[PDB]
Every structure is written in C-alpha cells, then in structure tokens.
Design a protein around this nucleic acid. Structure first.
Ligand SMILES: NC[C@@H]1O[C@H](O[C@H]2[C@@H](O)[C@H](O[C@@H]3[C@@H](O)[C@H](N)C[C@H](N)[C@H]3O[C@H]3O[C@H](CO)[C@@H](O)[C@H](O)[C@H]3N)O[C@@H]2CO)[C@H](N)[C@@H](O)[C@@H]1O
Ligand SMILES: NC[C@@H]1O[C@H](O[C@H]2[C@@H](O)[C@H](O[C@@H]3[C@@H](O)[C@H](N)C[C@H](N)[C@H]3O[C@H]3O[C@H](CO)[C@@H](O)[C@H](O)[C@H]3N)O[C@@H]2CO)[C@H](N)[C@@H](O)[C@@H]1O
Ligand SMILES: [Mg+2]
Ligand SMILES: [Mg+2]
Ligand SMILES: [Mg+2]
Ligand SMILES: [Mg+2]
Ligand SMILES: [Mg+2]
Ligand SMILES: [Mg+2]
Ligand SMILES: [Mg+2]
Ligand SMILES: [Mg+2]
Ligand SMILES: [Mg+2]
Ligand SMILES: [Mg+2]
Ligand SMILES: [Mg+2]
Ligand SMILES: [Mg+2]
Ligand SMILES: [Mg+2]
Ligand SMILES: [Mg+2]
Ligand SMILES: [Mg+2]
Ligand SMILES: [Mg+2]
Ligand SMILES: [Mg+2]
Ligand SMILES: [Mg+2]
Ligand SMILES: [Mg+2]
Ligand SMILES: [Mg+2]
Ligand SMILES: [Mg+2]
Ligand SMILES: [Mg+2]
Ligand SMILES: [Mg+2]
Ligand SMILES: [Mg+2]
Ligand SMILES: [Mg+2]
Ligand SMILES: [Mg+2]
Ligand SMILES: [Mg+2]
Ligand SMILES: [Mg+2]
Lengths: 159, 171, 296, 23, 208
RNA sequence: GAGGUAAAGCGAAUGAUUAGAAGUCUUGGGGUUGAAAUGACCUUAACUUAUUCUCAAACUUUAAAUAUGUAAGAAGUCCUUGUUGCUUAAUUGAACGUGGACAAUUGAAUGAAGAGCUUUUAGUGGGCCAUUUUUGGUAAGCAGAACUGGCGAUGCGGGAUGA
RNA sequence: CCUAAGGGGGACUCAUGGAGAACAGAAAUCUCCAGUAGAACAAAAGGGUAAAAGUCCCCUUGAUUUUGAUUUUCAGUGUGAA
RNA sequence: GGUUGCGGCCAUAUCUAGCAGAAAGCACCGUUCCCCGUUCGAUCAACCGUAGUUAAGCUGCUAAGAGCAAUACCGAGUAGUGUAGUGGGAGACCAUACGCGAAACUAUUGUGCUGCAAUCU
C-alpha cells in the first residue's frame, strides 16, 4: 500500500530546530507584512493552523493578501512545461521577510549617493557590478621569508 | 549570620493519614474521627490504581487524610507525642527535615470512644520549615530556597529535642 | 544505588525557557494574545494597561509593544498619591482606583482628550463603559494586562480597571469581578462598589475594631491616629483626591538629590570586579601547591 | 464530602511498574 | 543448511541489524571477544599486533569464531594461556537473509545468519603480548588469516598495548604521572575540570 | 533562503554491544561458622561511578558535494499631498493616485536566425540499453525505481563479428 | 470512536527516583526534595505540545447559517480532506 | 552604575557548591472585619507598612567546575563528493586529473547584551 498524505515525508522538514522548540518569540507576531513584500516560507511544526504544504517549505514569494493572522503569498510552481501561479494562505508563524530585498535596496541607495556626489564633483562614477577579476602583478619580499623547500614524505603505518 | 530570627525552624503543617484498606462505612467513620480531632472536613483519597490482593480498585475511596496548620497543629502534635511518651527514632526523620510517627489507637489521643465508630490507628507527618518558604510556593517569581536556609535531618532532630525535651533513639 | 541525575548530557540537551519566563514574571501565552494586532491594521499598535502590585506599590503603565522592547506611553505609581492627598494605605482597593484614574487622566492630558471624554464625574459605583462621542475621534482604547495575578471577584487590579474606565479610557470589561457582584443574582450592587471606591470597607473595619479591640486599632492604624483622621472622614480623603487628580494629572518627577553620575559612581564603589586571567592562574597554582599536604 | 483530585496523567493504566514481588 | 560464504561476501545491501522490525534473528556464532589474560595491566603487554582488512567486505560470524579459536589455540599451545590478550575488533551486526527457507513472488527473505561489515584498513583482530612472544603471536594470526576471505595484513603497532599512545609517548606520560591503572586499561590526566578531583586521582602529577 | 543524504557520533539522547576496575544499608546466592545476633569475613551475581571494543534503512548533536527557491530597478527609489463606506485615540495607516527630483554605466556575466500570442489536427500511450545512485534476489543476457545520455527512429569510421 | 475525547476560560504539572509515616510488605495512603518531559493527548506511526495541547474544574454547543477564494491529489476535472 | 515595572534577542543568560551585597527598590515578613478561595488565609482574596529580617528570594564575585558561546598554521585539505579517461585491479575496490569540501578531536578565549518608563547614598 502506497501512502501519499498531506504531511507525508515531513518528519525532519517540519521539526523545530534542536533546542528551539516551544513558544514562538513574539517578534514573529510583531513583524508587519505589506502587499508586495518578499517572504520566505518555513513551516512551524508547532502551529498546525495555516501550515503551508511541504512543497512551499523553503520557497520564497510575494505577499498579495493580508488578513487577521495570515498572509497570502504568490509562488510560481512548475507543472510540466510551464509555471502555475499558486496562492497559499499562511499564518505569520510560517513566514519571514526575505533578506534579499534589503541588500538590493541598499545597493540602490549607495548608487544614488555616489552618483549625486560625482555630479557634485563634476566627475563620473561607474556603478555596474563586476565579478571578481584576476589579480594583478606583485612582488614578494624574502626578508624573513626565504623559501623553505618541501619534499613528499615516505609511507608509514600509524596503527 | 546563622543566628538570625528568620532562620527559625517552625512547623509548616501536619498531615493526618488513615489508610483504611476498604470502602464504605468504615472509611466514613475514619473521616468522622478526623473531623472530630481536627475540627476540619478531611479529604478522602482514592486508589491511584487497582490491587486485588489489597482488595482495592482504582478510584475506590480507600484512605482519608487532613492537613492542619498553626497553633492547632502544635496541640494535636503534642497530644500525639504524649502517646509516644516523647520518644521518637532517628530513622523517623527525613533527609528533607520532616518527621513522622504512627499511633495505633485514636482514643489514646484523648477523644471520646464510640462503639459504633470503633478505633482507628492514625499516622502523623510534620512538614518543617523556616520563614520564606512562600518563595517556593508563591505564584509569581517562584524560585528555590538556598542550601543554608533548607531544613535538614540534623537541624530538625536537635530542634525537636530542644523544644520538647525528648530523646530520639537510634535502634 | 540510584542513577546520578545531573549528568553532563542532561545539561547539554537542556533547553532554557525564555529569560523572563524562568524569572516567573511573564505569561507569554497571555502576552501573545494581548499584543498581537490584526495584520491588516499594519503599524497601529494595541495598547496595554499593565497593572502590577508590590507589597508597597501599585504600578499602572500604558504600554505598546515593539520589536526592540515595550515602550511606555504614560505611567502612574501609587507613591504619587501623597501629592494628591492620599498618604496611607497605598495598596487599598481604593488606592488602585485612584491610580487608575490618575493614569487615565494623565494619558488623556498627554493626548489632548480632556474636555471631551471626562468620564464619570459623579462616581456612584454603577457599571458603565466610556462611549465614543458621535462625530468625533474615538476614545483611547487600552486592554488590561494583569500579568500573573489571579482574576477574582473583589481583586484590586479591577480597582485600577474601574478608575481608568471612569477616567475616560475605554477599557472593555464586565462588572462580575468587581466588589459587590452577586453571583447568585446576576446583578451588581453598585452601592457596594461605591463603598469600595471610597474606603468604606476599611472605615467599617476601623470603627468595628476600635470598639472591639481598641488596642489592635492602635497598632494597625497608627498613622491615622497621629493625623487625627477617624473613619467618618475617610470618604472625603478619596473624594478630594479624585478632584485634585482631575485638576492636575500631570507627572512631576521627584527632585533628584543627586545626578545620575554621582549615583553611578557611588554604586560603582561596591560590586565585586572580575579577576584577571593571570590572577586566577596564580590562584589555581596556589591551590594546586596547597593540595600537597595530603599526599599521606 | 471533599476528595483529593487526580494529578497523574497516567489515568488509563492497569497496575504499576516498581511492583514485582522479586524486590 | 548454510550456503557457501561466497553468496554473502559483498556489502550489497544496506545494513540490516536486529531491531524492532526483525526480531526472529538467530544468535551470532561469535559471543566471546576477549581471550587470554584479559585482566593483565597495560605494562605487562606492551607489544600490539593487528590483523587489518585490506578489503571492503563482509566476514561471517562463523569465520570470526573460527579464526578466533584458531589464534587462541595456537598461542596458548606455544606460549601459554597467560601470555597474551586477544581482542576481536569487529562485531557481526548485519543480518543476512535467505529466501527459499511461487518462484520470485513474495521473495523477501528470512534471517539466515550474521556478518560484520569491514572497511579498508579496518582492524579485525588485535593481540597484546610481550615482545619475546612476537613471532608466536604473528604466526597465531597468520593461521587465523586462513579462515577469512580476502586479504588481511599483519601489522605490528607502534603503540603501547591497546592504548592510543606510541611506545615512547606512553613512557613520557607515565613517568610524568599522567597515567593511572584502571584494571586492564588506564586513565589519562586532564587539564580541564575540577582541580581538586584531577589532583586527587593523580597524586604523582609533576605539574609544570 | 530551505534540506537531513554521503560523511561523522556513541567517555552526546534512543536502541544495540565486548572487557576489565573501584565502590554501595533492600548486595541475589553459595561457603568459614560463632550457639543465635544480618551484624563481619572468602566468593560469585546485581546495581552505581569513571573508563573500554564494536554498531543503526525505518537512531542522532553536527553535517557536505551535487541538485533546489527568491532577488539583481524606469512597472525602480525618494519627496509632497488627493480619494475611501476600510483602519487608527488621532490629522494614525492601507491601497490606488496628482505633482516634483534622480537620463543613458537605467544599476552583474554570457548568449540570443528576435520576442509574444492563438487555433487546429496526426501518430503515440508494449519499450529497451550504457555509466552512476539504488531495491528484492545466491545470482541471472532476472525483476523494479532516480538523473543524464543513447538505441528504438541512425547511416558512417573503430571494437574481426554484434541495436 | 467521542455531548465530549468538540469550544472557551481558569487552576495545576506528568513518567520516574531518593528520603521519610500504625497494621502496610516490592505494589494501598500520606510528606518533602529532585524531576526538559524520560508521561499523557481514542485508535497505526511520525511530527507537535509544560504557568500547555497533558491532569482537574466551571460554563457551553462554532459539530450552527449564506455562499465565494485557495492548498493537496490534479487534466490544475471530480471526490475526500484542509 | 544599582533597583523596580514592562520587554527584545532567548544559556556568553542555564545547573552545582561557596562567599559578599551600601542606598533605594524588591522581598520575606504582620493581621483576617470586609470582596474572594481553600481539608488547611499554605496557595488564592482582602487589610496594615504597623511588630521584625537581609536568613531566604534577588544581585554580584569565587571554581585548571559541568554545560553553553566564539575563534583557529587544531585535526584536515583527511572523510565524503560534482566532473574525466579504451586509467589500475579477476573482482572487491583503488590511484590520478579539474573542482567543492565536512563531523568528531585538540587548543585558546569568553560567561549576557540591550529598549521604554520610573527611582536611588
Ligand atoms: N598472495 C600469494 C603469495 O604471494 C605471492 O603471490 C603473488 C600473486 O600470485 C598474487 O596475486 C594474485 C594473482 O595471482 C591473481 N591472478 C589476481 C589477484 N588479484 C592477485 O591477488 C593479489 O592482489 C590483490 C589486489 O589486486 C590483493 O587483494 C590480494 O591480496 C593479492 N594476493 O599475490 C601476490 C602478489 O600480489 C607468491 N607468488 C605466492 O606464492 C604467495 O602465496
Ligand atoms: N524610461 C522611459 C520609458 O518609456 C516607455 O515608453 C515611452 C514611449 O515609447 C511611449 O510612447 C509614448 C506614448 O505613451 C505617449 N502617449 C505619446 C508619446 N508620443 C509616445 O512616445 C514616443 O512616441 C513618439 C511617436 O512615435 C516617438 O516619436 C517618440 O520617441 C516618443 N515621444 O510612452 C513612453 C513616453 O511617454 C514607457 N512607456 C515609460 O513608462 C518609461 O518612462
Ligand atoms: Mg483543525
Ligand atoms: Mg490568563
Ligand atoms: Mg554446492
Ligand atoms: Mg529521509
Ligand atoms: Mg541517516
Ligand atoms: Mg551513514
Ligand atoms: Mg558526528
Ligand atoms: Mg548511544
Ligand atoms: Mg561523546
Ligand atoms: Mg547506552
Ligand atoms: Mg488520438
Ligand atoms: Mg491518444
Ligand atoms: Mg514489452
Ligand atoms: Mg499497444
Ligand atoms: Mg516500434
Ligand atoms: Mg547512431
Ligand atoms: Mg563497421
Ligand atoms: Mg572483440
Ligand atoms: Mg482535545
Ligand atoms: Mg473541552
Ligand atoms: Mg489553561
Ligand atoms: Mg532519556
Ligand atoms: Mg527510559
Ligand atoms: Mg469571485
Ligand atoms: Mg481544483
Ligand atoms: Mg478537491
Ligand atoms: Mg485522502
Ligand atoms: Mg472543513
């Protein structure tokens, strides 16, 4: 007999973290979610109402609806050869703001401040990010660092 | 300082046990004797589980006990120490500073005998404690009592010998 | 031979509760229920009336909760009452009513809701809730937070409740936990509530004890004896205070005999200070050496 | 009249451990 | 009854131990793992010789018992029953299955025997004895090698007996008072924990 | 962001498991009894303490690699104040807006015979093979899954010959 | 299977061990201390739960009405369930 | 800086054993007419702040403490693993190549930080 129930295979996924069981710290209930916010979904095993399905555990999406104790999140789920918009109702215990917004919103502010300062200075500044490039030339001083010559060591048994 | 007023040993409570092995009228009579002696409605204890050998079943009312505190506890206690001629054992004192003994007839205590009631033996246990035990029993900010403020076996035995001029043998 | 319980594995796998639960001070079940706000009322906070009783003081605070910690809006303590004319019995049920009214009036003054939402100016002890004024801003809403204190009919926390309700704050409540509620006949004897508001029970105790055990009235109610205040003039003590509380509910801080820095330096004079690593190394070496004396 | 109430969550059992005549 | 061992040589299945899920498992033929003078102190038998697996393989409990008896017998024959302490270092916890005891329908097998799953470089047998008994103990192991499938190497340990210390580090730590006897084994001094208890347990501790 | 597989662990929980050692008032027994005292002794067995060998698909604190969700702007960021029967104690907010500011380095790489959209219909719905992960089985040119690539549907050069 | 084993509130803390109390003993009842859950939660197992979701008490019927949206299985049809 | 009330993160905060703690606060502490709850004013309820105490709670310090946290020319570029070959080996398995890379262990260091309000020698 095959078993494919709603919470099948969630033995470890829906567990609380080790030494992190019990009551929810109330910052979870004090956070404010607005329509358009990006939130990660991670199911709390101790709150059984409003739990996401195991598919959305570990997924990240956008809030589209705000209710008394829950938020609505839009997830794009792959079904065959296209994506389908899934609209999941989640209590805020299973939701956390995505930390990817605050870095990108910070890169926008930093770009704006430098650009307006080069404009103030009558100069130019380049803002496109670049991947790490190969390192330049350099000179190695040997004062205190004359090279030590190594050789492969013979075979030994240590038991 | 070890000689502080608030370190004074004193009785917190005395608990009265009659473990009648059966149910019905006899247990009711034990409750009546306890109500006579203490002046308070006693409480009936139900078996926590069933034993056929003892003739008890779970939730069958077997025993009766009552808790008394204050001056009355001292009076009932001295009435019971009179039956023992003021001579307890070393073993009778627990490591937590509590002590107890057991009488065999309740008319030796000094109450009227009724043939209908009969005689019940009775079991006595005293919970000793200094001031400040409410710390471990209050609702808000419950904590433990520090080790020096705790009641132990030796302090209670010495306190009992001094306050009652009795001897605690150790056979 | 029994098993040792406090093993190293026992300490390793132990999960400490929240710090303020292990102190036995916060009921986080009730706190969560009080604080959480409808998420569609996005940043509008819910306001709590925290009421706490010490052996000598009544603390009443209006609090809103935030992620960095709770923030006090206003606070009224029972030791402010001597300014208003109540110097003794700083833990009456009536002192609780006075503290609630004081914190209510002070909060409405801070907000600007004085002429509108005065409250029950003629206190007869009847159950009543502050109704909003039509075509105007709603009254300041606060929910009572009694903490760990048990809810009993006749408790002092509901004295702060009734005072704050009469002070103009809208605090949702029912009268069945007030003194004077008949549980058999589900109606409130408002006469007995008015009695409790103006120290009637204490006054009845003064007259009844002086005429039975005069010596005991001399020990329990000394301060009343040295002020020549009898039972018959207790009601006015609160009634005057009430008026004064409504006349100027503003907070006056104690003139400070010292500044923060002198207090800090004096307290800093005490408090043991941690030993340096070298110090404890010398200490351990000394103890190691001093263990020789039992080689036998 | 008044009776002690139950505190032990092992309400549904049968006998008890610890019991076993051998000890 | 018993199939040839070639049918169960390789670790083809996941570990299948006795558990709450299979209970009707026979007992391993090997029950005895320490032989010779197992109560000897650490200084009596300084020389250690291991029989090490050079194969990732399964060894039956039957083979373990046979090799153990062979080695024990030879060494007691040549050097005496009190000249060594032999220890078998692998325990057969993996249950083998047999099917017939129609066709392939419902073919989940029943417990048939037990085997130890050994790795490359894993020690199978350890023998602590005196040095003068080296050539004896080695030949005792060389015969036992014949009862096993695959390749095994006889390696003389650099360490003192069954301790994790080399034959030189043990002498340094012993003359420094950091080692005490515990019957057949020893306890080493720790520079962590209760100072008084550590000092009490090691009176001869020359502190630095 | 999520994960609980490889590995690792067992003087960490659970469960399993080899060996001694030191101790304890229900030591579990035998033995030397002294006349009986349960109060010693020799012993084996229990427990307790600190150690020791070996383990887990349906154990686990930890915990990869590979694989996996989101974001990387003009539909963006900020300022001001309009609408509402929703919301706030509110002149507080929510959503959607008017007006204003930030100009081609408009905010990573690489590519893009361009992107988006619609209708209609065929055949097919027995599969098999190779590497690797993997289950049952002693195993099978056996049976069953995972990813990819293939044969089928494909000739050509090589493997003599061979899907 | 359950008028509670549903709903709300409140109070309490469970398994187990040690030390103690007439008959009473390994197991009857009482007391203190310890006690991260080693228990209990109808029924398989897993997850979850400690001023509770467990034990006890009080009051109840939200196991009610109208229909929409969504999640799982999915063709993104139905049914069940949420 | 101490202290109280309400807190955030939830052991660097816990556990065990000692010792110390000015001021204020907190606390233990005294009493039972009244509201209230108990077998028991022990808990809960109310009153007094009067008769007493820092003994306890609490706070701080001590401990080659247990536990916890952090760091690393610690272990270890080890185990494992993505990719490759008409590589080795009868096989089991192993080496090499381009990449990623643990856990245990060891050593060292640390033992709450902090928001709002009030108060104090
Ligand atoms: N091991 C046998 C002994 O050593 C020598 O024998 C040598 C060889 O005969 C023997 O080699 C055999 C080989 O014969 C046979 N055809 C193939 C087999 N795999 C090899 O086996 C060898 O190598 C494998 C590793 O590949 C090892 O696992 C195994 O232990 C080893 N014997 O192993 C030795 C070298 O590896 C002596 N000639 C012989 O007399 C003696 O018994
Ligand atoms: N970052 C510039 C972007 O321009 C885009 O589009 C711009 C235009 O391409 C687009 O078209 C606009 C049209 O909307 C508006 N109602 C009239 C206007 N003439 C058009 O714009 C264009 O059309 C003409 C005619 O061919 C061109 O010659 C000329 O390039 C330009 N004026 O509208 C925008 C200008 O109003 C986005 N729509 C705009 O939101 C965004 O700011
Ligand atoms: Mg439900
Ligand atoms: Mg509550
Ligand atoms: Mg054959
Ligand atoms: Mg799994
Ligand atoms: Mg696993
Ligand atoms: Mg593994
Ligand atoms: Mg590990
Ligand atoms: Mg283990
Ligand atoms: Mg370990
Ligand atoms: Mg174990
Ligand atoms: Mg067709
Ligand atoms: Mg078709
Ligand atoms: Mg076919
Ligand atoms: Mg066909
Ligand atoms: Mg075909
Ligand atoms: Mg081809
Ligand atoms: Mg060809
Ligand atoms: Mg060929
Ligand atoms: Mg239920
Ligand atoms: Mg119910
Ligand atoms: Mg409750
Ligand atoms: Mg356990
Ligand atoms: Mg257990
Ligand atoms: Mg619609
Ligand atoms: Mg559907
Ligand atoms: Mg459906
Ligand atoms: Mg179903
Ligand atoms: Mg439903």
């Amino acid at each position: 007999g095959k078993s494919r129930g709603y919470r099948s295979g969630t033995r470890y996924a829906f567990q609380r973290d080790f030494k992190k069981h019990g009551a929810i710290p109330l910052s979870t209930y004090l956070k404010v979610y607005k329509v358009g916010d990006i939130v990660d979904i991670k199911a709390n095993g101790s709150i059984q109402k409003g739990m996401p399905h195991k598919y959305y555990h570990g997924k990240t999406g956008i809030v589209y609806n705000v209710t008394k104790s829950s938020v609505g999140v839009i997830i794009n789920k792959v079904v065959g050869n296209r994506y389908i918009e899934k609209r999941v109702n989640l209590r805020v215990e299973h939701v956390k703001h995505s930390a990817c917004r605050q870095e990108f919103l910070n890169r926008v502010k930093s770009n704006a401040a430098k650009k307006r300062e080069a404009k103030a200075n009558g100069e130019t500044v380049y803002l496109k990010r670049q991947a790490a490039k190969p390192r330049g030339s350099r000179i190695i001083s040997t004062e205190g660092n004359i090279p030590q010559t190594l050789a492969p060591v013979a075979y030994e048994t240590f038991i | 300082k070890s000689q502080n007023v608030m370190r004074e040993l004193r009785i917190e409570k005395l608990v009265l046990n009659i473990c009648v092995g059966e149910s019905g009228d006899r247990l009711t009579r034990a409750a009546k004797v306890l109500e006579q002696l203490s002046g308070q409605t006693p409480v009936q204890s139900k078996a926590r589980y069933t034993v056929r050998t003892f003739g008890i079943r779970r939730n069958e009312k077997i025993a009766v006990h009552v808790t008394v505190r204050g001056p009355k506890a001292e009076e009932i206690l001295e009435r019971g120490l009179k039956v023992k001629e003021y001579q307890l054992r070393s073993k009778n004192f627990s490591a937590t500073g509590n002590f107890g003994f057991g009488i065999d007839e309740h008319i030796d205590l000094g109450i009227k005998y009724d043939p209908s009631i009969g005689i019940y033996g009775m079991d006595f246990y005293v919970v000793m404690g200094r001031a400040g035990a409410r710390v471990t029993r209050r609702k808000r900010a419950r904590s433990t009592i520090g080790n020096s403020h705790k009641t132990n076996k030796e302090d209670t035995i010495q306190w009992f010998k001094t306050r009652y001029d009795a001897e605690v043998l150790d056979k | 031979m029994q098993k040792e319980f406090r093993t190293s594995a026992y300490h390793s796998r132990f999960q400490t509760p929240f710090r303020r639960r292990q102190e036995g001070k916060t009921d986080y079940y009730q706190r969560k229920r009080l604080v959480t706000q409808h998420k569609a009322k996005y940043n509008s906070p819910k306001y709590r009336l925290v009421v706490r009783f010490t052996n000598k003081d009544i603390i009443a605070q209006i609090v809103s909760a935030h992620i960095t910690g709770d923030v006090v809006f206003t606070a009224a303590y029972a030791h402010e009452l001597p300014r208003y004319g109540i110097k003794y019995g700083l833990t009456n049920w009536s002192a609780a009513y006075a503290v609630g009214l004081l914190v209510a009036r002070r909060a409405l003054q801070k907000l600007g809701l004085d002429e509108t939402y005065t409250g029950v100016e003629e206190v007869e002890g009847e159950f009543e809730l502050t109704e909003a004024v039509e075509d105007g801003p709603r009254p300041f809403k606060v929910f009572l937070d009694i903490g760990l204190q048990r809810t009993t009919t006749g408790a002092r926390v509901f004295g702060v409740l009734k005072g704050a309700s009469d002070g103009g704050l809208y605090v949702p409540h029912s009268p069945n936990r007030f003194p004077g509620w008949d549980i058999e006949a589900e109606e409130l004897d408002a006469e007995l509530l008015r009695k409790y508001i103006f120290g009637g029970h204490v006054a009845e105790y003064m007259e009844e004890l002086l005429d039975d055990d005069e010596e005991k009235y001399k020990s329990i109610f000394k301060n009343y004896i040295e002020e020549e205040i009898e039972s018959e003039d207790v009601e006015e003590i609160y009634a005057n205070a009430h008026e004064a509380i409504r006349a100027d509910p503003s907070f006056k801080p104690t003139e400070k005999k010292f500044t923060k820095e002198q207090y800090k330096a004096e307290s800093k004079k005490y408090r043991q200070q941690k030993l340096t690593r070298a110090e404890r190394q010398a200490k351990v070496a000394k103890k190691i050496a001093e263990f020789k004396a039992q080689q036998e | 009249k008044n009776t002690s109430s139950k505190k032990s969550d092992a309400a549904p059992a049968s006998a008890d451990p610890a019991k076993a005549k051998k000890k | 009854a018993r199939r040839p061992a070639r049918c169960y040589r390789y670790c083809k299945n996941k570990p299948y131990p006795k558990s709450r899920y299979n209970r009707a498992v026979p007992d391993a033929k090997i029950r005895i793992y320490d032989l010779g003078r197992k109560k000897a102190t650490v200084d009596e038998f300084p020389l250690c010789i291991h029989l090490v697996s050079n194969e990732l393989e399964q060894l039956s409990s039957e083979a373990l018992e046979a090799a153990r008896i062979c080695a024990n017998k030879y060494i007691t024959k040549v050097s005496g029953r009190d000249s060594f302490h032999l220890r078998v270092r692998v325990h057969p916890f993996h249950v083998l299955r047999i099917n017939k005891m129609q066709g392939m329908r419902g073919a989940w097998g029943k417990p048939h025997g037990l085997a130890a799953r050994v790795s490359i470089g894993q020690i199978i047998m350890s023998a602590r004895t005196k040095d003068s008994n080296k050539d004896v103990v080695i030949e005792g192991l060389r015969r036992a090698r014949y009862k096993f499938p695959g390749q095994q190497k006889i390696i003389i340990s650099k360490k003192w007996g069954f301790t994790p210390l080399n034959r030189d580090e043990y002498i340094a730590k012993k003359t420094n008072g950091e080692v005490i006897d515990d019957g057949a084994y020893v306890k080493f001094l720790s520079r962590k924990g209760n100072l008084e208890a550590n000092l009490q347990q090691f009176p001869n501790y020359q502190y630095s």
